[PDB]
Write an enzyme that holds these catalytic residues in place. Sequence first.
Site, PDB file in Angstrom:
ATOM      1  CD  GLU B 274       0.631  16.186   1.047  1.00 30.28           C
ATOM      2  OE1 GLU B 274      -0.445  16.135   1.289  1.00 30.28           O
ATOM      3  OE2 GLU B 274       1.289  15.389   0.651  1.00 30.28           O
ATOM      4  CD  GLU B 277       4.299  17.589   7.030  1.00 27.48           C
ATOM      5  OE1 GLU B 277       3.651  17.936   7.668  1.00 27.48           O
ATOM      6  OE2 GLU B 277       3.860  16.204   7.139  1.00 27.48           O
ATOM      7  CB  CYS B 294      -4.615  11.934   0.599  1.00 31.47           C
ATOM      8  SG  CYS B 294      -4.018  11.786  -0.686  1.00 31.47           S
ATOM      9  CB  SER B 314       1.975  13.908   4.150  1.00 29.82           C
ATOM     10  OG  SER B 314       1.265  14.917   4.922  1.00 29.82           O
ATOM     11  CE  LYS B 353     -11.051   8.845   1.813  1.00 27.47           C
ATOM     12  NZ  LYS B 353      -9.408   9.267   3.032  1.00 27.47           N
ATOM     13  CD  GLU B 356      -8.172   8.260   6.814  1.00 27.57           C
ATOM     14  OE1 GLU B 356      -9.536   8.296   6.313  1.00 27.57           O
ATOM     15  OE2 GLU B 356      -7.248   8.848   6.500  1.00 27.57           O
ATOM     16  CD  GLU B 361      -4.145   6.984  14.601  1.00 25.61           C
ATOM     17  OE1 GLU B 361      -5.104   6.126  14.560  1.00 25.61           O
ATOM     18  OE2 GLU B 361      -3.043   6.089  13.807  1.00 25.61           O
ATOM     19  CB  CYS B 486     -10.799   8.311  -5.352  1.00 25.77           C
ATOM     20  SG  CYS B 486      -9.536   8.199  -4.118  1.00 25.77           S
TER      21      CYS B 486
HETATM   22  S1  SF4 Z   1     -10.279   4.875  -3.153  1.00 23.42           S
HETATM   23 FE1  SF4 Z   1      -8.547   3.427  -3.589  1.00 23.42          FE
HETATM   24  S2  SF4 Z   1      -7.242   5.512  -3.889  1.00 23.42           S
HETATM   25 FE2  SF4 Z   1      -9.104   6.414  -2.698  1.00 23.42          FE
HETATM   26  S3  SF4 Z   1      -8.953   6.892  -1.119  1.00 23.42           S
HETATM   27 FE3  SF4 Z   1      -9.782   4.752  -1.066  1.00 23.42          FE
HETATM   28  S4  SF4 Z   1      -8.183   3.592  -1.599  1.00 23.42           S
HETATM   29 FE4  SF4 Z   1      -7.508   4.889  -1.681  1.00 23.42          FE
END
Ligand code: SF4
Lengths: 560, 642, 92, 156
Positions: B274, B277, B294, B314, B353, B356, B361, B486
């Site tokens: 990144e 980039e 991220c 990004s 996550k 995700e 993708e 996080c």
């Molecule tokens: S814990 Fe919260 S800030 Fe960290 S990646 Fe997950 S949603 Fe985003």
Amino acid sequence: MFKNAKEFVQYANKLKTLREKKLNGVSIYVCVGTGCTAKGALKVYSAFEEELKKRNLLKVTLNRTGCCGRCSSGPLVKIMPYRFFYSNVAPEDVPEIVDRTVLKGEPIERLFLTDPLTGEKVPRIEDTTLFKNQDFYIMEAIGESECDSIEDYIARSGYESLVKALTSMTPEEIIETVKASGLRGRGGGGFPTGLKWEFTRKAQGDIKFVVCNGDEGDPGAFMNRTLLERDPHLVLEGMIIAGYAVGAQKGYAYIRAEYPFAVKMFKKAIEDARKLGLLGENILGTGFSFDLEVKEGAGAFVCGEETALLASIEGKRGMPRPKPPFPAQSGLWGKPTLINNVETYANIPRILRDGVENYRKRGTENSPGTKMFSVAGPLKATGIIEVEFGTTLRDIIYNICGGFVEGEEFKAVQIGGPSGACLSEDFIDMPLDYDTLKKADAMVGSGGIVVITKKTCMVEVARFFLDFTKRESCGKCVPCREGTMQAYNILEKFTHGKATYEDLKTLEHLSKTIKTASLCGLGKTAPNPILSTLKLFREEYIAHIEGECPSGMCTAFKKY
Amino acid sequence: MKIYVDGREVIINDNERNLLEALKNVGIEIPNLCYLSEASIYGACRMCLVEINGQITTSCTLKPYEGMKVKTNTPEIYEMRRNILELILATHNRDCTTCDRNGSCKLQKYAEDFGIRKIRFEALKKEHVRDESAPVVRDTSKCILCGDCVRVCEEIQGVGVIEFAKRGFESVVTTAFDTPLIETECVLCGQCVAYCPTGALSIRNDIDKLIEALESDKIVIGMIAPAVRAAIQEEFGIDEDVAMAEKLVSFLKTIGFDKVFDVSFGADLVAYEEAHEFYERLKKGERLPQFTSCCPAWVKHAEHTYPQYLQNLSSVKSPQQALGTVIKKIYARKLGVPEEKIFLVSFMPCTAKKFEAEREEHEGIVDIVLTTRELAQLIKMSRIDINRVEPQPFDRPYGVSSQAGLGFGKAGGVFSCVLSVLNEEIGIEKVDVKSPEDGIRVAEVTLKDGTSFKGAVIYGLGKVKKFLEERKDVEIIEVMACNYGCVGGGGQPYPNDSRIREHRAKVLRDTMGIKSLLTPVENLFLMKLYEEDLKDEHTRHEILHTTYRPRRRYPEKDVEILPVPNGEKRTVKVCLGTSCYTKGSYEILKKLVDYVKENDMEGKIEVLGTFCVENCGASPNVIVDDKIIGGATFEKVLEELS
Amino acid sequence: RDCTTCDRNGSCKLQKYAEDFGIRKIRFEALKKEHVRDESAPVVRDTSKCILCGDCVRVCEEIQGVGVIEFAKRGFESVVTTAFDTPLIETE
Amino acid sequence: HFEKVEEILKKYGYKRENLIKILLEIQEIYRYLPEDVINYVSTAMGIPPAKIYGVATFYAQFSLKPKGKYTIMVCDGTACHMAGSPEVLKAIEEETGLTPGNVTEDLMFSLDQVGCLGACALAPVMVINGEVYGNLTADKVKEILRKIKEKERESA
Ligand code: SF4
Ligand SMILES: Cc1cc2nc3c(=O)[nH]c(=O)nc-3n(C[C@H](O)[C@H](O)[C@H](O)COP(=O)(O)O)c2cc1C
Ligand code: SF4
Ligand code: SF4
Ligand code: SF4
Ligand code: SF4
Ligand code: SF4
Ligand code: FES
Ligand code: FES
Ligand code: FES
Ligand code: FES
Ligand SMILES: [Zn+2]
């Protein structure tokens, strides 16, 4: 009448002359208030229009009037030059009325008002015993006032009080006279309105609001809507005077969308007042600016609470909040807000026009004025009535409403809807007051009255009121939200003849919790029917625990 | 101020908002179910009743005054409090064994303390909602209607996808029209879960999949998030512990993990990519400002709310996806084992996550994502004292990472890592950092050559809207959906308020401090990865880069009368608007319904109701096979159906 | 699984293990058992919370010497009860 | 492609203070609140759909299902309730097979119990498309329901 007050005075004088001219002539007024329209008042008006048009003898004039207090006596029609009151006027006998009365003028015996007490028919409503037994102070020109006419309201001396307040008096004197008159909140609480006006005025803020609560506060009352449809300009003038007294520049009227005629009448009154200059950026050229808007109520009983009403106006869910900070300081959008009932605003201009001693001539030392009610249930005469603040329930039930229909007997009376009280015959001879009966577990309430007869199961009455409250709870606080449904469940068990003394004990103990721990007034008064019926009709609950039901309506055990 | 509580002199405080808070500050506790999290308000539980001057009232709404006599315990108050608690428990879904708040639930503790052993009230039935379509699971039968989640989603996160609906006994916190949370604009940050005091909001548990995978013959590979090691110690009630990650490695290897890696390596790789980039974007002055990708919650939020900024995101995928793709596509080849044989387990502090890893993708890269709480459950099952576990280092070649990579666990980590990468590549003359607000930090950075830019770090979704609306003088913007980054993720141990989040950030900073290499390039393994596997740009683009697509609700939600679940049909829709209703439409609908009642034995015809189709003034309308007719009637729709 | 109205709530080993093992659902359907609930005596019985550990039987027989509760039936219908499901207040 | 809704929103200036009035207008046009319509309203006003849903499900005047061809309104006020409104509701259910708040399969009938209609002299009272029928009983309610059923069935 848009620059000085003398032009308004001349306008009012000539409007009075015109009204006298029209009144001296032949004119027709058909009561188009709620109830009469339900019986076909609008079709009667259409019949009058078509018959009077085809004959083409219009110097007759046809007008729409508001409720005349005899809703149960069919659609109401009266002619002015001979003040003959006609009841149960069907759209089929309109040509007969026109030919016999409007043209010739012969009294029609068959179409008059019967007297429930003396069993006779009187040509004039003003000569009826019920009419004399009442006390009309707010409702005036019964049957001869145009609901949809600012011109008529002005011609009947209307809007004079607002001009007197603006040109002559200053807000402080207005609030002082309101305090001195002793007017109390007609919304049900009875709080002195003058103190509320002091609270709003003293609040630190340049912008303030005036809010009118059109809600009936009862699913069995129609006082406020009837008053709005009778003389919307009276409430309009009262609201303008209140806004001037508390220094507000914007007022909101909260009328249910369920009431199309009330909304239409108030909107038309507002538009007429604005067009004639009573509302606008400069009223009567005195530097005072004020406008009014009608806000539609989408329907929620909890919106009668002040905080819930304010939330509803602002476009949110009608959720009440802990009362402090009070709306008198931080109401609409955090600004001071004066909130009063429709009847309070209607009273205001009457007090201003009259004096303080003259106003106090009617009522009691602590409850001066008059109260408009809506009596219902099985009675000879039901509808809207006005009485002095000293009358008893017997006077209303028998002498004013004519008593009960043949084959019926008195059991109990509901005086304030679910939040009200259930009164037996032991309180019938108690003068109505905000203080005399506020200590005997009773309250005048918003003004609704429903009589209960011997063939009514009072356990079912409590079940009905608790079902209503369970439906209307906003669901915010645990006591109301949960306990109302639990108490309704217990009452339903009682009705279905499968209750027990344990259920009775649980209901009695849960009522105290709901009454004490609830956030707002809805849940606080939610168990009022339970407490009233258990204090006055315990033996009926006991009989239900035994599967007897002395009244015998609720079908849970029969023909076994 | 001096007050009398139950007849004894008590000094509360000089200035206080209400009696309850003042007494709590003193140390006198009144039972209540309102103060349940940082997003709590007062007035709903009604359990804080105290007696003053004879009348009972709530102490949370009572302003204290000098020399006030207050009785906090009377038989009437006991009766009322027990009645309120029994009312709450009557309609509560009392299954604590399978509840996610078991052992940390205030309602459960009160039920224990209040000696409630039987329900005097009826467990009445409600139209409860059970949403399990997303990693955030909704179960309104355990909801106490405190409203903390609504305030968190609206005021704190700025999404407002969950709200109170209906009223009375039917009051429920839910999405609009009971839409599945996966189908709404929810970003799955998990903050509502972090603040929920009951099991109504919980995280989807996927321990069973991990156990069945470990039991299989596949090679299980684990990778731990930087912020997981900074908060896992709370679940066991022990003090902060650097080297937490290595004893976690030991435990995971004990329970059968073949390899365990560090997601901090992926963070370093992502930061390097990144940084390059962003430098290209700067030199071209295009696609600016740039947004970090991220945080998957922020990425989904942008897809829902800023379709015009999707080109500014990004291209680099998040550390989890980057490291997982590197594993599956390079490590598998280096080990000579098919990609199907490797089972990839991610240990994250985030619920987004999970979403995700299931994105189209990223299909098939990360097999399962387990939150910090699920990892703590794994440890607690074994009953081994993790504090006594001897640490061992992560596995090569993705085990080491720079301090900057481990900094990803808290807000400002990726921006600092990018700054370090740029500084090493091209020095930075100076950095000036400002703090316009609490969760917003802006840095002005000057490079050695002379070209300068501005970068902003924003943690806590909902602050992004104002910053984007008013600030247009930045080139790179870091967005973290959760407060403090996080360390305050949705999957972190409960409770998850600000004090614990700050302590977690301190723990992660202490862990960072003991790392020797300071920048990603100093990571020899990362440079070896670039030199051997990611040498060319095509492979690098297919490995570390992804594309984003806009999100827009596709609601048909037409009125269903005689629906057909599936199969080829005619899908006839009758307009039910006022203009169409004014003449015929309802009669036509009745006739068609009766027709399919006498004819249409099978599901050939599907009779639907639809709202105004913006064709008013052209007679009643009847949509057939998604076609406009106009002047429709029973015969005119029968002819088309032929 | 109704811990709110249970006397071991907060001090139950089974509750703690359910919390620790992350058992958030049961794929094993809740079979119906002929459970025995007793309220006749100050000692209250509820076999729907019983894990059939046998500690109560040993306590009553070996320690107290009364032996009024014992294992009855077998298999899935295994239950710790009094003779002929007699209410406790009517036993010895 | 919404036009009337855009007209209403512009008339009330995309202000949340007028959300209830906007919803009343939208219902008057569409006869109910479709999910798509208020999704569009939310997008136009920048207000999340959950907020509009919370508002809509709080007030009685708002219906989430289409109103029946012959909308039935049975007063549940105190006077009408003691006069026999529950019997009227039972007759309506047994005839049309529905309870208040529901609609029939073909959207022919819908039912809602409301407060006092201001005609307590006619208790119990029922309203169908503005036509009020008072002094009702089970037999009368069933008879009128059959009559309206046949009248509508004729079509012609
Ligand atoms: S814990 Fe919260 S800030 Fe960290 S990646 Fe997950 S949603 Fe985003
Ligand atoms: C459930 C509930 C319903 C109410 N309904 C009304 C109402 O319909 N009209 C009214 O004037 N007051 C109503 N009230 C009382 C008002 O909310 C409050 O007393 C207000 O200040 C009225 O002002 P007033 O006393 O000047 O009339 C209601 C209160 C509750 C708790
Ligand atoms: S008492 Fe009832 S209406 Fe009042 S706030 Fe509580 S739940 Fe809402
Ligand atoms: S939220 Fe969960 S732990 Fe708490 S009382 Fe309800 S079921 Fe039990
Ligand atoms: S996960 Fe985040 S966005 Fe989704 S409902 Fe909860 S707080 Fe709102
Ligand atoms: S879901 Fe949880 S946080 Fe939201 S209102 Fe219910 S109990 Fe409170
Ligand atoms: S066997 Fe006895 S001691 Fe063991 S759980 Fe059952 S009742 Fe309790
Ligand atoms: S509405 Fe006509 S007399 Fe009351
Ligand atoms: S603390 Fe909950 S109402 Fe007072
Ligand atoms: S009402 Fe049918 S197209 Fe609009
Ligand atoms: S109570 Fe039904 S019309 Fe008045
Ligand atoms: Zn009965």
